[PDB]
Amino acid sequence: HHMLIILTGLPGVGKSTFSKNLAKILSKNNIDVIVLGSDLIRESFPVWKEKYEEFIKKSTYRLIDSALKNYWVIVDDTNYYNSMRRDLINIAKKYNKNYAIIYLKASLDVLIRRNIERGEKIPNEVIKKMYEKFDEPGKKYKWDEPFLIIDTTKDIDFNEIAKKLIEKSKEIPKFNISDKIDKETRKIVSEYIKSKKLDKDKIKEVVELRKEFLKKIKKMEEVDADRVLKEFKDLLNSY
Amino acid sequence: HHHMLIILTGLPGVGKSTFSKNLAKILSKNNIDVIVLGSDLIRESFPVWKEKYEEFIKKSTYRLIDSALKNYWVIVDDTNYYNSMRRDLINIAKKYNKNYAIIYLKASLDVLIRRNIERGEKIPNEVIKKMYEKFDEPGKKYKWDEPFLIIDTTKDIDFNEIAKKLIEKSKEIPKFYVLEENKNKNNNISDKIDKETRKIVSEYIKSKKLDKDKIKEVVELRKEFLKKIKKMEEVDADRVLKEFKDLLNSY
RNA sequence: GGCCGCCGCCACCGGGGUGGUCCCCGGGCCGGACGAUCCGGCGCGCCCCGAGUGGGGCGCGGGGUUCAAUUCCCCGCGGCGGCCGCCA
RNA sequence: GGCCGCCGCCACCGGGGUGGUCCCCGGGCCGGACUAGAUCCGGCGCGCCCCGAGUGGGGCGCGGGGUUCAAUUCCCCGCGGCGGCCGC
Numbered sequence: 152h153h154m155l156i157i158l159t160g161l162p163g164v165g166k167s168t169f170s171k172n173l174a175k176i177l178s179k180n181n182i183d184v185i186v187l188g189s190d191l192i193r194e195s196f197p198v199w200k201e202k203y204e205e206f207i208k209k210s211t212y213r214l215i216d217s218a219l220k221n222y223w224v225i226v227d228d229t230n231y232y233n234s235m236r237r238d239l240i241n242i243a244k245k246y247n248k249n250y251a252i253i254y255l256k257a258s259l260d261v262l263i264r265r266n267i268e269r270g271e272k273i274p275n276e277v278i279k280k281m282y283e284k285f286d287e288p289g290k291k292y293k294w295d296e297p298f299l300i301i302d303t304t305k306d307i308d309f310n311e312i313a314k315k316l317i318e319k320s321k322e323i324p325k326f327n328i329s330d331k332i333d334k335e336t337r338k339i340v341s342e343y344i345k346s347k348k349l350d351k352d353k354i355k356e357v358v359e360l361r362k363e364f365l366k367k368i369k370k371m372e373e374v375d376a377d378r379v380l381k382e383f384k385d386l387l388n389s390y
Numbered sequence: 391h392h393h394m395l396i397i398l399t400g401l402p403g404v405g406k407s408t409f410s411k412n413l414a415k416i417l418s419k420n421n422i423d424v425i426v427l428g429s430d431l432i433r434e435s436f437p438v439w440k441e442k443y444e445e446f447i448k449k450s451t452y453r454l455i456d457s458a459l460k461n462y463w464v465i466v467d468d469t470n471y472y473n474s475m476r477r478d479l480i481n482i483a484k485k486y487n488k489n490y491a492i493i494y495l496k497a498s499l500d501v502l503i504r505r506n507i508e509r510g511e512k513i514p515n516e517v518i519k520k521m522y523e524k525f526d527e528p529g530k531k532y533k534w535d536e537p538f539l540i541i542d543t544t545k546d547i548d549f550n551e552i553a554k555k556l557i558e559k560s561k562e563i564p565k566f567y568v569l570e571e572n573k574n575k576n577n578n579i580s581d582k583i584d585k586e587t588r589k590i591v592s593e594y595i596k597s598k599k600l601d602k603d604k605i606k607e608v609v610e611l612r613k614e615f616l617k618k619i620k621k622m623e624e625v626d627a628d629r630v631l632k633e634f635k636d637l638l639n640s641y
Numbered sequence: 642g643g644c645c646g647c648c649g650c651c652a653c654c655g656g657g658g659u660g661g662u663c664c665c666c667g668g669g670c671c672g673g674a675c676g677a678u679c680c681g682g683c684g685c686g687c688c689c690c691g692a693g694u695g696g697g698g699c700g701c702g703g704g705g706u707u708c709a710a711u712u713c714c715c716c717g718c719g720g721c722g723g724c725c726g727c728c729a
Numbered sequence: 730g731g732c733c734g735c736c737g738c739c740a741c742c743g744g745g746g747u748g749g750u751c752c753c754c755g756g757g758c759c760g761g762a763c764u765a766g767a768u769c770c771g772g773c774g775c776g777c778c779c780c781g782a783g784u785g786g787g788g789c790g791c792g793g794g795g796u797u798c799a800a801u802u803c804c805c806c807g808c809g810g811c812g813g814c815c816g817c
């Protein structure tokens with residue numbers, strides 16, 4: 152069967168590169184897989200503007216959503232907030248597909264390094280900040296626990312990852328009358344105990360009086376709430 | 391004014407993507423919200439190509455353009471080899487009553503092969519030659535397919551001029567749904583007088599076997615009569631038609 | 642490219658009407674008498690008279706019905722919508 | 730990361746309800762009835778104590794404290810399990 156693979160990690164950690172390589176190995180193992188991320192649409196605009204984010208976010212989600220109907224989808228996005236990963240998981244749940252969160256990690260050193268090597272189009276200060284605010288996968292919710300944690304400073308074994316993911320895709324993602332009688336007879340008993348201030352010994356009789364009464368009732372086939380309750384009220388009035 | 395759909399068309403390696411980015415940049419400096427979209431966005435998200443992904447690719451790409459045109463100028467960076475493809479892109483713009491301009495980019499087979507080689511010949515040169523050979527320039531069969539601009543991408547391109555021309559055109563009223571404006575009509579009484587005076591004129595022409603000359607006077611006699619009547623406020627159909635019959639009788 | 646539905650082929654543009662040589666409503670422009678207003682008009686082609694660069698005549702894809710076709714009928718070309726085919 | 734919360738601590742398991750000494754629902758298992766069946770009847774955990782020392786019977790308790798005539802329920806603390814919204 153097929154699944155939703157959710158990457159998470161800071162800008163420059165290697166999400167996009169890891170995505171392409173993962174997809175390529177999967178393709179060799181005979182799987183139809185597509186790589187999606189908010190960046191596809193975000194970079195389609197010639198400049199950045201806060202006001203495009205809504206459309207960017209909505210459109211990326213529609214593509215992911217429509218793609219998971221027929222293909223494995225690798226979501227290549229920073230996904231720094233747990234609520235963002237929750238949102239992606241809701242798509243998998245909706246289609247009853249399995250999902251795996253893959254957390255790519257790297258020291259802040261490497262991150263700043265790589266960011267400089269890219270023209271620091273994202274200011275290093277913002278990178279530092281994001282590293283601090285990042286939501287550690289699984290620290291808050293079991294559903295957020297990373298299927299794998301990848302160290303992008305060391306070599307990566309895609310065949311092994313593929314193998315594990317393929318196995319995971321084969322798992323099963325699972326994700327009147329009577330009570331009325333009990334409820335109400337309980338109310339009546341409390342009403343009665345109040346109106347007569349019975350003693351410790353006489354209340355116990357009333358309790359037992361109700362147990363015996365209820366037990367007898369669950370024996371008869373035809374039972375009408377209102378009529379049974381009336382029978383109970385008068386049983387107490389003459390006891 | 392408002393926003394429009396810019397449709398690019400031209401063979402692989404002609405420079406569509408490069409032209410797209412530059413045009414999008416200039417438009418942006420000119421205060422326009424524009425996005426660049428093409429089937430490649432989705433096609434290259436797959437690690438391999440398979441003909442069965444194409445339906446999805448097409449469905450996905452059109453949905454994006456469609457939803458984006460509600461809010462932004464859309465530049466479509468796709469080969470758009472066939473007119474029916476450009477037609478489908480126009481129907482999106484008609485769906486939202488937005489202007490559109492087909493921009494046709496060309497270059498000699500000479501440059502296309504060279505550039506195709508410099509790209510590792512992912513597309514066999516043979517295919518490039520053939521595509522180039524069978525390609526029908528836009529506008530050769532349909533008027534709605536006539537390019538707004540034809541750009542030689544081997545020559546210098548002036549993006550400010552183009553941007554300028556594009557902005558002007560966005561400020562025009564599309565000839566899409568000006569075909570449903572069923573109004574500016576006269577009240578039933580007026581139209582009833584037009585219709586009836588027309589039949590009376592015909593009845594009269596018959597009863598007196600007029601010649602081409604004498605008929606023209608009757609026609610002008612009707613024109614002058616209706617003109618005068620639409621100047622009065624209170625008009626009774628039956629009364630007016632009698633006045634017209636008599637006007638003809640003492641002619 | 643094929644099938645079906647519908648519309649255009651009256652001529653500044655849009656819409657509408659119509660067996661009257663077109664007409665109506667809104668928009669545009671030109672001319673004229675008087676500058677608003679009012680009155681006349683508007684494309685293309687062929688011919689003719691004129692001699693000055695104007696006036697007039699015939700025509701508007703083909704054919705039919707008819708005194709008369711923009712209108713009705715058959716065919717041709719084109720538009721729009723629907724459905725199929727095409728789509729390195 | 731912030732704010733908040735749900736579930737269990739009634740006792741085969743899971744879900745639900747409930748100030749009445751617990752109950753309802755689904756599943757499971759044990760014993761009996763049953764010319765493999767199904768249905769019907771009875772029942773189910775841990776701890777300490779007692780008669781018997783019989784694969785038997787009875788008693789009391791169910792993390793601690795509080796409100797109570799009565800707590801599975803409600804408040805507070807404890808242990809174990811899990812989530813929501815928002816941070817965009």
Ligand SMILES: Nc1ncnc2c1ncn2[C@@H]1O[C@H](COP(=O)(O)OP(=O)(O)NP(=O)(O)O)[C@@H](O)[C@H]1O
Binds near residue numbers: 161304
């Ligand atoms: N596994 C790796 N080891 C070392 N360098 C890497 C590795 N993966 C990627 N890089 C380099 O790190 C830089 C950024 O890689 P990239 O995959 O674009 O990160 P990203 O997380 O997708 N970035 P962003 O899209 O901005 O969040 C480039 O120089 C990559 O070549």
Ligand SMILES: Nc1ncnc2c1ncn2[C@@H]1O[C@H](COP(=O)(O)OP(=O)(O)NP(=O)(O)O)[C@@H](O)[C@H]1O
Binds near residue numbers: 403407409
């Ligand atoms: N105006 C230009 N002058 C010189 N080279 C150009 C020009 N435009 C594009 N190129 C180059 O031609 C090659 C392809 O350009 P590109 O804009 O990607 O063409 P394309 O039509 O988008 N190709 P494709 O996506 O395969 O249909 C690259 O080397 C471009 O830099």
Ligand SMILES: [Mg+2]
Binds near residue numbers: 166167168190227
């Ligand atoms: Mg990336």
Ligand SMILES: [Mg+2]
Binds near residue numbers: 406
């Ligand atoms: Mg391109």
